[model samples]
Target: IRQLLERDKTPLAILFMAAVVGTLVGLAAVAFDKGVAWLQNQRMGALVHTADNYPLLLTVAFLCSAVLAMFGYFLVRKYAPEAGGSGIPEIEGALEDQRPVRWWRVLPVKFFGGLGTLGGGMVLGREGPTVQIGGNIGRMVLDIFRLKGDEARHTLLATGAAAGLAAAFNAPLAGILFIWEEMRPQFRYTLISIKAVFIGVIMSTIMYRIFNHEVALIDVGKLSDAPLNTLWLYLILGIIFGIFGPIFNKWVLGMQDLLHRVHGGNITKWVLMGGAIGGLCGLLGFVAPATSGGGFNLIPIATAGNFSMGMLVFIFVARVITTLLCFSSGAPGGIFAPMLALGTVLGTAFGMVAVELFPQYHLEAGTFAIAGMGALLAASIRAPLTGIILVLEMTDNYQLWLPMIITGLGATLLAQFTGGKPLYSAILARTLAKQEAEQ
Candidate 1:
């Protein structure tokens, strides 16, 4: 009788837990965004101060960036090894019970450590780390509350990831679809889990709006729509991305392999490699700031056709190299925004060329920029829905729906035919293979 009377009566406690997870993840995401911005402001301010003297400017830039990235690398090597790179795959592995989530170490390490690498102007995205942080926060909540059962763990893990994406981009639907599309294999669909995800996303979005103003991440303004006659050009753009997508993924993997070989498990050597790369990036930023950072600031500007075709091509190619270098070094950052910037560069170039070739259609390069933004993402990540929605949400360009869909489909179809594995999945598989070998 006493046991029956003392039973826990909160049947829908998971919903409350989901709200808590979302709120916490929102705060974390905001903090991360603000923290990175503050660091960048300080770094850039210092560089500006020393810019009058070219020699001093160059020396200060290189040394400061080298030390910043070295700190990030050191933290990853010494404290939480898994905190390196995007860490999205790490979350995926944790969901499948194939990897462990060390939230206590990962949270602080990824936050401060990422600020170092990203703050140094390395070409990386905040979205990946935001997602990872959200996932870790989910696990952290579970452990704190002593939540038991597989369902509880699974639900919270997914909830936090969704919330994180929403916070990162201010796109609630895209966040939810990312789980449905990108994480289809790992995410279990249940009524409670879906509900929890919805609740979490809403709360995080609310919190995000509270801290940051409600505005689209990328604002290129509304552009002209793609006509039926010119729709094939979008497909052509898609085809270009489709062909490049596999090659890009291969290059990334190859670079990672090459870097690993060079480092050979030596912490000092790894940190040195990072410093050299970071220093070079800092110098490159002085040369061409557009090619150095995560590309968020460059996206809308590039999409606006600010550069000529030749310049666009040059920047695209240069950024591709920079993206490869920074990402392959296993810096604590993401490739998502960098890839978007690359796509915008190439897309604008293509659109500019198309405009010259076919003047009758009255093409707008911005439209293609919007289309290409999602196409490469669709092809490489193999998550067309999420990619489409993400771009749409970021730019608020809902009028080019058909063009966007065609481009995404064409990109994914061609990429699949080329037999390229999804980037995150490939990374996760590689990690799993190494783990198995060790065991």
Candidate 2:
């Protein structure tokens, strides 16, 4: 009778649990970021480790990065198979109940695994690991609270994902809009769900501010908005990204297939090669500071017009190759920031050319950088609203919102028109197909 009575009751404390998850995820994000930063310094022998021993630092960086990345690869392979790669697809799958949230494995693997890969100075972003871990924590909370109903689990899971992103970028509104738009198909929108997401974002943002506080991610300064007459130029740039979009997807995915076949599903070979990628990136970090890591540091520099046109083009191509290689190698990180930097450099390069082509516009190529900052994301992910909002929030370049929208919309439309698929969906589908094939 007592057991029956207990089974009949459900707690209305989900929002409270969600808030707790948000705070935990937010702190987790900050800690991960800080941990990566510390490792970067130690890897490069910077600050207290600084000794002007460039060669020594280079060797140390490469070795340390390799070791770190090997740890990440080992964890992912042995513990949580889904922890490899961007991890967003995993979270999405969880939201749809198509995948299990092995939080016990994922939380630790993603946390420490990110400490390895992201800390290794590889060209990877934190958002992927952050979102994955956040969602896992949501599930953990639910299990602890003995939550009932799919609605509660689903609601908190989505909330944590949203808050993870918001905490990662320190952009709550963008996080809110991401699920509102990008995850529309999977997200079960209801009053309670909405409230949970809202509260989670609020709590997450608050915790983020406590740590980061009022600082824009990119710090591009107050960029000038493009004139209406120049909007067409952004459209043209969009078309350029549109052209590149399908190319990027096909080539990137092809590379992934090629590597997977090369490894023949051998975890040892796969991890060694991935470790090499991370090690080489560590070496590259010192050789050309702009070319390695997640590329967030390069954004302000690129948009500040430090690199010449020729240099811009070279770095764009170089980073493109590295981005493709590192991401396709199945690293447990994100391509989001790396792609953003590439878009900035590529668009800024175009802007440089446009200056010569159209001398009358009195143009600022940096504005183009801001506009096209998220174009590739829009085209690749095919989530224009989230892409544009992310750019707008990341750079705080509100004046360029229209141009960003134009660029993102044009890129997405053209990519779709050119038979391009959404990157995350393709990843998720591939994973599911492979799972089915293995079964």
Candidate 3:
């Protein structure tokens, strides 16, 4: 171990590897993003021309969605079962040497399979699969070049994951902090290696700009700061999110168990659940648009105050159900985006109420929108810095950094006090338990 650590102590060589990781991760992420976008556009074009014909459009959407979902499920079962769910947990497992990184199968299966499932309009996020695949690519490079040292392997994997996140959301700072904060347990943080992560993030950010032109993934217009006097309201919001975060995590695990019981590892049963979830989401897309699909499109609408408190609550409940159903059904997607959406909806509702009670303060509820954005993630993941940096990078509102930090800290602290384990860690543990049980 000592020899392994000392072998790659040179800063310059580490930086060079970081650059390579950044370039590759960035290319992979940009390609994945564009590919998914293209598929979505194609789906849109097909649906648009059939808009006037409701019955046929619904049939086409459901059929297309079922087929895509089945493809994702088939790929996971046949080749890379470990790539299922948010690939983050798998990476975490890999870091601990508890899981294998089958990059040969995972990269292709997750990339193409994720595109199909997500483009089919399932409520999934791309970052999870992208980060996992990016890490795998790093490992693949190491194997191909016959780099056998432990430090070289570990640093490259972490750097690649950070680069992938930077490209995924165009958030370099968050990408670095995510490695430092969220992956701290597994990441062997040395001064040289941390610098590599920073370099990797910077390169990925530049690459993302080349393709996507550096736009905030979620462009909720900036709002006034949460005033010192009204800070208690923000705390209240954090506490609420703290409670919801653990409950949400519990439900996620519970739903997974429920699905397992129903499916009994039967391929047909799993596909039918995916189909049923996809079909319902497609149908709900028309009647209650806000409650269906990934929550990315709904963030701006919620922050814009288009919906009243009642409507926000209604959408929140509806989305919670849909998110649970879709994600628990074992579709190839991540819950990160949906969790952010959930936070926004609940935060907006709280903000609306606060504004009514304290009209004298002239507070902007949108401030709560920003605060709430990362609170749930912080509480659930117990990674306050990553959550804060992620939201700040996504929105480009650096001035609100302190408030975001406070909110995230508050949420995480309360969550810890309430005995909530980090969601990803819990998921990994559950996966390991299942593996042992089967053995």
lDDT, candidates in the order shown: 0.85, 0.83, 0.79
- Candidate with more favorable, higher lDDT: 1 or 2: 1
Off by over 4 Å in 1: 1-11, 186-192
- Candidates in order, TM-scores: namely 0.95, 0.93, 0.93
**Ordering by TM-score:** 1, 3, 2
Query: How badly does each model clash, as a count of residue pairs?
Result: 0, 0, 0
lDDT of 1 by residue, 1-439 (tens): 5335434433377778989999999999899888888977887888889878989888888888889999988898899999888888888787787889999999998888888888888888887788888989989888999988877887788888899988988989888888777754644443227777878899999888998876767888889877899989988899888889999999999999899888988999999999998888887777788878878777888788888777887888889998899888888888877878887787788888888899899899888888888887888877888889988888988999899999888899899999987898999999999999988
Top-scoring candidate (TM-score): 1
| Residue 303, candidate 2: C-alpha displacement in angstroms | 0.8
Candidate 2: C-alpha RMSD to true structure equals: 5.4
RMSD of each: 4.9, 5.4, 3.6
TM-score attained by model 1 = 0.95
Give residue 97's error in model 3 in angstroms: 1.4
Against the hidden true structure, what lDDT does model 3 obtain? 0.79
Model 1 clashing residue pairs (backbone): none
